[PDB]
Amino acid sequence: VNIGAVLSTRKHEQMFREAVNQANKRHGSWKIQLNATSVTHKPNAIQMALSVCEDLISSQVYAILVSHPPTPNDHFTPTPVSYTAGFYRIPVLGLTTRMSIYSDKSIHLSFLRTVPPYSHQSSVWFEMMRVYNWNHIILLVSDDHEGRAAQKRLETLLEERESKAEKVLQFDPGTKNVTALLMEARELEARVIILSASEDDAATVYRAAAMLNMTGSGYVWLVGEREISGNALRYAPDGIIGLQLINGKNESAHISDAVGVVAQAVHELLEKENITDPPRGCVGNTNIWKTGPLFKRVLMSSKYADGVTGRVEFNEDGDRKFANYSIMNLQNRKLVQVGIYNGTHVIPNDRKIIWPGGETEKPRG
Amino acid sequence: DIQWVLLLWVPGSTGDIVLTQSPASLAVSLGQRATISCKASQSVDYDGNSYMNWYQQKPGQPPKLLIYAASNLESGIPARFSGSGSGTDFTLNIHPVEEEDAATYYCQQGNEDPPTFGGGTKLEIKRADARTVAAPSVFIFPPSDEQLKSGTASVVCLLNNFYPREAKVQWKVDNALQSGNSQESVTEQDSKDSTYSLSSTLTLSKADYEKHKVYACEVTHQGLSSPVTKSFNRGEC
Amino acid sequence: DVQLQESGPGLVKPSQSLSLTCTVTGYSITSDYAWNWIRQFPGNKLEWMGYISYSGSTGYNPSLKSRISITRDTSKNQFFLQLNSVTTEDTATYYCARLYYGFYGMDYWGQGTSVTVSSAKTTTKGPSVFPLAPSSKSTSGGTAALGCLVKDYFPEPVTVSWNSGALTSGVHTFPAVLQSSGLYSLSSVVTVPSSSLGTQTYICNVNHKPSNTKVDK
Q1: Between chains, do B20 and C147 touch, taking CB under 8 Å as contact?
Q2: Which residues lie below 8 Å from residue A180, measured CB to CB, with a gap of 6+?
Q3: S-S: C75 plus which of A10, A146, A232, B192, CB 3.0-4.6 Å?
Q4: Which residues, in sequence order, are CB contacts of A212 under 8 Å at separation 6+?
């Protein structure tokens, strides 16, 4: 019943301690006897991996939590902990990164998160497209690694919608010669700009479009969670659709939601039989966790009746539960908002969608 | 050395004068008692009366000691009041409120070798009470194009009838989490209506002005309860 | 969002590395606002330095980057500063908080915290309190003749307040100039009625923040 944790900032450690101290038995009905422990992340990736391999798997932990922004790998992803704990089918909570490539179950056996990856963002964009009949759209994704998976998911969903897009290919990561493709898109069906790149890779496209006065009516800009922050708000046109998921921005709320999900998973595991401990990773031990596929099934293949989010219909991939969205608009950096996605269908809010074209009704998309 | 000359003439809320009576000034106009209590129960009673030489530094007249030691009238100042008192209680009831008796009485410590100051309560108008109010203007002067091209602009708002203590800087623009966009700029005060002047060096560049929707400020003072804010959009060069 | 208590040290060595207590207690720092120090000095305008990212990028101006190395502390969510060679113009009220990009208008205070480059010099001595007795035989027009007589203590950047200030019925701002000798005598007095004179004395509560001298009488 021992549970571990691996954070870097002191605030995350304090929040985890408070979460495991108070309101830890509220999730469910069984009186749990978990032994919560936390390990501070090392500045070096090898030393931290060694500490993980000598502490977590040796103490027979069931789940972890990685949510610190300043990762020691300088890539904003928990690489060593995941590569060390993937052998024992340990559900490495990679809620600190949104990379859709790492969320795939191909190269990562047990790697879940509570943050919508690029695949979930593309799914939400596709769901918003079919509402206003946005079939012929263009994709200006400049990123390659995750952009390939993004455009693959986009084209597969378009084929599943009995249709086919026109531009689903990439040109160059962070280029400045997009004038030709922009002039070609000036005489296309829809001006819906689909950009799912990084900070600088999207800022380059934003400034290149601003240099060509690409801020007319009908340009629906679909951004992600970490695409407009710090300085990308000025380069992007005023009125972008800024997607934001509940307990995704706040670190404390995200950690609380992750702890609640872990508690619900432990309770569901204790409800059934075959309650075995993972093999202790000592010297010479190369044993595989027997309850690995069953744990994956009770994590992603099953549903959750309670928890922090209090929603149902959990995704079959362990990426993010389909729930209500908090999509806020950024008209001149104000508190305006647009139609949010409520898990199953977009429901308009009190104030309607404001468009950068000048009007508030359906633009000339 | 313990008390030097401050920026303005009145002590104000945060003033370096401990011998002051009123925060801003006394509510005296003409022919009424204006007691300038400069009581100081410090180590100045060196076997006799406490030395207290109060003087004025009005613009145009050099600082001249009115009464030395608060006991004997100094030859050179016309007898226009009754300045007496021994120990710590100093009787300085200034009943005649004329154009000459409307300066900051700098109560200098006679037992202190370095020239000290005191008082500061100028006998002028005080529009800070319930009936006496002060409402400045509400027109916002648009910043010049040169200040916008130079990066560091200055959105100076027109404030004429206000006091240094009445500096409403708490703004509220669509829940803007910022800290620091102006200062408490003041100028010389007038004996007619206390005409001050407020300015603001708020930096506003081309990009910042481009990503700017409204400029609804808050000029709510004790007298100007309903200020007409000028929430203009971009392009007001 | 109002828990950003800007604490400025007043006992730092002159022309040395200034480490301002940039207390950031609130929303998570995820490169949302402009966390930088505003140099508001009388005589020159404020210069926009830059901002910090979620993990630390030091996106400040290239001019004040070599001799001004801005640090980042994500563990305690309270980063320090390394302002070396604090000159006369550098000594001013800084605003180390979050700023929304766009310059729409600040909701915080407009005074700041002056980081005075001072030490255990003659400017800060033992507060010599005096037995100020309220004289009932005094009528200063419509106001009273209260106040305190605390001298020879911490200069202007001290945090002297009224007797348990919770209402602040007269605690306003006032532009003042620093004294050459440093023996400041700031006596904050609220607007009290004339009837309050003699019945109850009001002595300012001189509270030294960097010196921890809670002596007032």
Answers
A1: yes
A2: none
A3: A10
A4: A179, A182
* Rounded Cα distance, A320 and A245, in Å: 10
With CA atoms as reference, report the closest residue to B233 among B219, B207, B215.
B215
Instruction: Give, as one character, the DSSP assignment of residue C42.
Output: T
End-to-end CA distance of chain C: 36
Give bridge partners of residue B107 from the DSSP assignment: B54
Dihedral-angle region of residue A167 (phi above 0 means left; psi in -120 to 50 means alpha; beta otherwise): beta
- Give the HSE-up count for residue A348: Cα atoms under 13 Å, Cβ half-sphere: 7
d(CA A269, CA A317): 18
DSSP string covering C67-130? SB------SSS-----B-S--TTT-SEE--B---TT-----S-SS-EE-----SSTTS---B--
Strands A193-194, A221-223: parallel, antiparallel or unpaired by DSSP? Answer: parallel
| Cβ <8 Å between A69 and C32 | no
The number of C-beta contacts closer than 8 angstroms across A and C is 49
- In this complex, the residue of A69, A249, A333 whose CB is nearest that of residue C55 is A69
User: In angstroms, what CA-CA distances link C83 with A102, C17, C119, C156?
Assistant: 41, 5, 17, 22
Task: Select the residue of A233, A234, A334 nearest B174 (Cβ to Cβ).
Answer: A334
How many residues can be counted in chain A?
365
Method used to obtain the model = cryo-EM
C74 to chain A, closest Cα gap in Å: 6
Do A333 and C27 make contact, defined as CB atoms within 8 angstroms?
no
Using a CB-CB distance cutoff of 8 angstroms, which residues of chain B are in contact with residue C148? Answer: 18
CB C3 within 8 A of CB C26: yes
What's the resolution in A?
Answer: 7.7
